[PDB]
Amino acid sequence: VSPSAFLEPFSASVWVMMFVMLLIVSAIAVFVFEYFSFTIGKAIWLLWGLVFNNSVPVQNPKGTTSKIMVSVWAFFAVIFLASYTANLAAFMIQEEFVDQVTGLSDKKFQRPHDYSPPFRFGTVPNGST
Amino acid sequence: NGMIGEVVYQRAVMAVGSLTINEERSEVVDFSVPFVETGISVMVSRSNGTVSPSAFLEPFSASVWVMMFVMLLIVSAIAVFVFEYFSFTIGKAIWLLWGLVFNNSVPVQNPKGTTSKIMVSVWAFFAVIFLASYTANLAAFMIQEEFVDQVTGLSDKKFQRPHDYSPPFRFGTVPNGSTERNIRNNYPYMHQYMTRFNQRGVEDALVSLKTGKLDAFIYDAAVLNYKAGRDEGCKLVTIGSGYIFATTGYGIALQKGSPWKRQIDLALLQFVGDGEM
Amino acid sequence: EELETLWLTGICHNEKNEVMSSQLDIDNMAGVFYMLAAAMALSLITFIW
Amino acid sequence: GSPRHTVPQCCYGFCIDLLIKLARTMNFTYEVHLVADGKFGTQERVNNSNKKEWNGMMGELLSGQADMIVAPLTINNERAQYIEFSKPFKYQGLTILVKKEIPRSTLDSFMQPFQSTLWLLVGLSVHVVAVMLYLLDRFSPLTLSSAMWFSWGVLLNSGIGEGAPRSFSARILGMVWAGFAMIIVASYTANLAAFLVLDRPEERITGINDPRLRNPSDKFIYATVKQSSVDIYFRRQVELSTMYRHMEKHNYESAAEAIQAVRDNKLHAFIWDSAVLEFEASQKCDLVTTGELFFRSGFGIGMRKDSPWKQNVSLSILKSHENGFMEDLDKTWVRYQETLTFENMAGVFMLVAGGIVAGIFLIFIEIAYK
Amino acid sequence: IIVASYTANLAAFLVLDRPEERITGINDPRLRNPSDKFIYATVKQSSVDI
Amino acid sequence: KTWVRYQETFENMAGVFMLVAGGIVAGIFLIFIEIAYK
Ligand SMILES: *[C@@H]1O[C@H](CO)[C@@H](O[C@@H]2O[C@H](CO)[C@@H](O)[C@H](O)[C@H]2NC(C)=O)[C@H](O)[C@H]1NC(C)=O
Ligand SMILES: *[C@@H]1O[C@H](CO)[C@@H](O[C@@H]2O[C@H](CO)[C@@H](O)[C@H](O)[C@H]2NC(C)=O)[C@H](O)[C@H]1NC(C)=O
Ligand SMILES: *[C@@H]1O[C@H](CO)[C@@H](O)[C@H](O)[C@H]1NC(C)=O
Ligand SMILES: *[C@@H]1O[C@H](CO)[C@@H](O)[C@H](O)[C@H]1NC(C)=O
Ligand SMILES: *[C@@H]1O[C@H](CO)[C@@H](O)[C@H](O)[C@H]1NC(C)=O
Numbered sequence A: 001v002s003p004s005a006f007l008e009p010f011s012a013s014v015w016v017m018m019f020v021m022l023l024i025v026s027a028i029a030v031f032v033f034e035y036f037s038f039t040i041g042k043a044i045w046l047l048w049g050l051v052f053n054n055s056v057p058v059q060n061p062k063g064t065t066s067k068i069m070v071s072v073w074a075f076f077a078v079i080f081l082a083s084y085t086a087n088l089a090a091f092m093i094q095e096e097f098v099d100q101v102t103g104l105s106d107k108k109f110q111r112p113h114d115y116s117p118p119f120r121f122g123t124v125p126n127g128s129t
Numbered sequence B: 001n002g003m004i005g006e007v008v009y010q011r012a013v014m015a016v017g018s019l020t021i022n023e024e025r026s027e028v029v030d031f032s033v034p035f036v037e038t039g040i041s042v043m044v045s046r047s048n049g050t051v052s053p054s055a056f057l058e059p060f061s062a063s064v065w066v067m068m069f070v071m072l073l074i075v076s077a078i079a080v081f082v083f084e085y086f087s088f089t090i091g092k093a094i095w096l097l098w099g100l101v102f103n104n105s106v107p108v109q110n111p112k113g114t115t116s117k118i119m120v121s122v123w124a125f126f127a128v129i130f131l132a133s134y135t136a137n138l139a140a141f142m143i144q145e146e147f148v149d150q151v152t153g154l155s156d157k158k159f160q161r162p163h164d165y166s167p168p169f170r171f172g173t174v175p176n177g178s179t180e181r182n183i184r185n186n187y188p189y190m191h192q193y194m195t196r197f198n199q200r201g202v203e204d205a206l207v208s209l210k211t212g213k214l215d216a217f218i219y220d221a222a223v224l225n226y227k228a229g230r231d232e233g234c235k236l237v238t239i240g241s242g243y244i245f246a247t248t249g250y251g252i253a254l255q256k257g258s259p260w261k262r263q264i265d266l267a268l269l270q271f272v273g274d275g276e277m
Numbered sequence C: 001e002e003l004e005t006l007w008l009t010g011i012c013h014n015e016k017n018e019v020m021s022s023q024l025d026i027d028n029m030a031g032v033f034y035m036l037a038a039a040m041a042l043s044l045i046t047f048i049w
Numbered sequence D: 001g002s003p004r005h006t007v008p009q010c011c012y013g014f015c016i017d018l019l020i021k022l023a024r025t026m027n028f029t030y031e032v033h034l035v036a037d038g039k040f041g042t043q044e045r046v047n048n049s050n051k052k053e054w055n056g057m058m059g060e061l062l063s064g065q066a067d068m069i070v071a072p073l074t075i076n077n078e079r080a081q082y083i084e085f086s087k088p089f090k091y092q093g094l095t096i097l098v099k100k101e102i103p104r105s106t107l108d109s110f111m112q113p114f115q116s117t118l119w120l121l122v123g124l125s126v127h128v129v130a131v132m133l134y135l136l137d138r139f140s141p142l143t144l145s146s147a148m149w150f151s152w153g154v155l156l157n158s159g160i161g162e163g164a165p166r167s168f169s170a171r172i173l174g175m176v177w178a179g180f181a182m183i184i185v186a187s188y189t190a191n192l193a194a195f196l197v198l199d200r201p202e203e204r205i206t207g208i209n210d211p212r213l214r215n216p217s218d219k220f221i222y223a224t225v226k227q228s229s230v231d232i233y234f235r236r237q238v239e240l241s242t243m244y245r246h247m248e249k250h251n252y253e254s255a256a257e258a259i260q261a262v263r264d265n266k267l268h269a270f271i272w273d274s275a276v277l278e279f280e281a282s283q284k285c286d287l288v289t290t291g292e293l294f295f296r297s298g299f300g301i302g303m304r305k306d307s308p309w310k311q312n313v314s315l316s317i318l319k320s321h322e323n324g325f326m327e328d329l330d331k332t333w334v335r336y337q338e339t340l341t342f343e344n345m346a347g348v349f350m351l352v353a354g355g356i357v358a359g360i361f362l363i364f365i366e367i368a369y370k
Numbered sequence E: 001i002i003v004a005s006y007t008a009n010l011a012a013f014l015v016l017d018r019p020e021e022r023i024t025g026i027n028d029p030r031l032r033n034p035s036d037k038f039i040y041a042t043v044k045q046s047s048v049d050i
Numbered sequence F: 001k002t003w004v005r006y007q008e009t010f011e012n013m014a015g016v017f018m019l020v021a022g023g024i025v026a027g028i029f030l031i032f033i034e035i036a037y038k
């Protein structure tokens, strides 16, 4: 039936902790940039572009600590990507099969104007059904 | 001794229970027709072996690789043409083009003449779907499972000498068995190295295979197949199904001159002849 | 029980997980387009100020 | 076909070498000839007397034309009531040979076997993205091809020497486009992989326990050898009359007829001995049998009544069992066996090379203009 | 290639469960020939006993 | 329907978040030591 459950059903609260660690790493990067040329507010876009690593040229940080945090964050993002691919594989393999009608007393069965296709059903004539 | 000691010395009639078949028992008494395919087999400890994800020849098979080199040379030549129209990427084009397959190289100067960027984008989209197919092959590796068998059969070079290989092991049989006579009629050195590797109890030898007090054991095929099929823990699957083995059966021994032999053979073929067996 | 095992076929079991997932979902990129339209609205908010 | 062309020819193979071993063990001379028909032998009616007779190897043995039958003797209960058997050298059952050999995923469903939503979808998506980036860039609160190349590079994820434009509010658009691109390619990789894992339907029979063969039709054409002992074995059993009536309509003379018929899809299934079908599966790679094994029987030596070639012959057979001559017979015949990007990514590279030629043409037109 | 094999291994360790950790078949010979661990029972003087 | 029918990224996040958070907390102290070194 191929359902769609990606962020709102699965990541109901994991998304919050991902943003918490994102704000932590961004605060670390801002502290390193303010310790020792425009990566104060742009560090958030740089960090969430290096989450997915989608060929976004930004800059090369001269601070060693910034590159260490980028390396640890990138390893975290790679294992998060592997876990997301495994989650999608488990979502495909554990495949439910819902039905359009889940009841003899369906509201569809009163009138096929309830939904856009008018469906059809019958029995055999002269039967106990 | 035993059932042969009861039938040959005429203190019994027949052996309806299970019995091994060899030439000397065919000399002293008369067997019936067989009814079940019961050869011999070897039960080992068989810990969790590898699945061997070592090699892969499915995407390229050492022949699409020429097409990779040809298209690398084409992209390099058109990059040289862009360099002639318009930066050291003459011989570095192969390094760039296979380096950006794995998208973590140092970005060399890409020309703004719209040509090299588009062809690198096309080959890189092909590389993205190629890595997708490679991960798909690695995921399809999960479908099959095969831990490798240590010993193929009775003619193994491991069975020549355990000192010939770097781990020495041990193999056992049941005492005073017909399998011992089959060994002594095939390989006397097998009996010599089996003499110091004896045992007493069949279930005790099974526990010794479980607890690592025994490496290999030789017995009849289907009995070990059933005892592994009912095995708690389910850690025993026999190597092969009687291919490099004795390939005998179970018969009913009767005295030489018994009139019951024809009726018993017809009754066994009747019990096979309806699927009730 | 033997007669109902004999005279009733049982190959097609309950909710097999076979090939019938045909690689297309419609609601997935629809929801991604809902979040994309939210991104359009946020881009318009950042554009006006 | 040919009533009166009988030729002395050369015979060899498995049971011929078995007979040569028997002649090496026991001291005798022999005479090897072939059976007149191509049948095993069945208790079948003759045209008079209301009496059934025999034919085939049994029909030539009981008539006195033969003395000893070395053959794949299908051991049953009917023949033992008349003649004597031997202890079997071969142990072998029954199974079904079908055609479960059809290639799946002929192009791996990249863009052409799958429907055309994704390519046009990415196309008009990056078109609308480029249009709104131009609306942001021309009115800030080259330019065209640079924004296009940045859009394709963020959509494509390889790393190229480009640069983002002044994106004080367009960096939100770029990060949403980046998450967009990676969630699409991740879902696409994941469901293509999990699709080609679970691409195993059921087109087989699964042995005797198939109610599609208990109530057959013209879809599963299963047959047997004309006047076979397996047909007698199914004629005896009390509930196998339906498969008997199905197979009696398409009785074939030799097994190779059924092999070529299931090779050319004239049949759909065939009841036959197991190890012979395993040998022919090693011969023809487009043949795989089923798994359910039934009627585990033996192949031995067709024999007469009380005869001096019963005792020592059985002793010689068991002598062949105890030594490694069974392993020799294995090494001669029994043990002796015999995302590819060629069907799949051929058309992929065809469309890639067409895009190469079209891009080269457009680039030379651009150089001719500039 | 290493991290792709890592992703495949961690996916394969999430595909399957432990199949048949307890026996479901009534016609199991493990149920026909029980042990001290197979504590199967019924209600005293029930129709299952009959 | 009253009582018979009535019944009564989660796994891959907890230990990963805790271990990576503890590693980053230890790494910040390592950065204090390295900046005190230079
Ligand atoms: C159900 O039963 C009724 C009554 O027998 C059937 O109605 C008849 O239908 C035919 C046409 O098929 C008419 O010519 C007759 O006049 C009807 N009634 C009589 C007097 O027989 C009806 O066809 C049945 N429906 C089915 C198929 O079950
Ligand atoms: C097998 O089939 C026939 C024999 O019936 C052979 O073909 C010719 O048949 C005619 C009779 O119809 C004979 O007079 C000829 O002598 C046969 N030809 C030859 C050359 O012998 C055929 O040759 C045989 N061989 C095959 C094809 O297996
Ligand atoms: C085997 O036979 C010998 C005969 O003396 C006997 O001593 C020995 O205990 C037997 N072993 C077993 C248990 O089979
Ligand atoms: C075997 O038979 C042949 C032919 O009759 C004979 O010459 C030979 O002496 C026989 N040998 C033995 C062992 O009897
Ligand atoms: C004899 O019987 C068979 C069936 O067993 C039949 O096909 C044939 O036509 C009959 N005629 C002859 C050959 O006498």
Ligand SMILES: *[C@@H]1O[C@H](CO)[C@@H](O)[C@H](O)[C@H]1NC(C)=O
Pocket (backbone or CB within 6 Å): D308, D309, D310, D311, D312
């Ligand atoms: C069978 O073998 C015995 C062994 O002593 C031999 O004497 C005899 O001549 C052989 N021939 C028969 C009777 O088959």
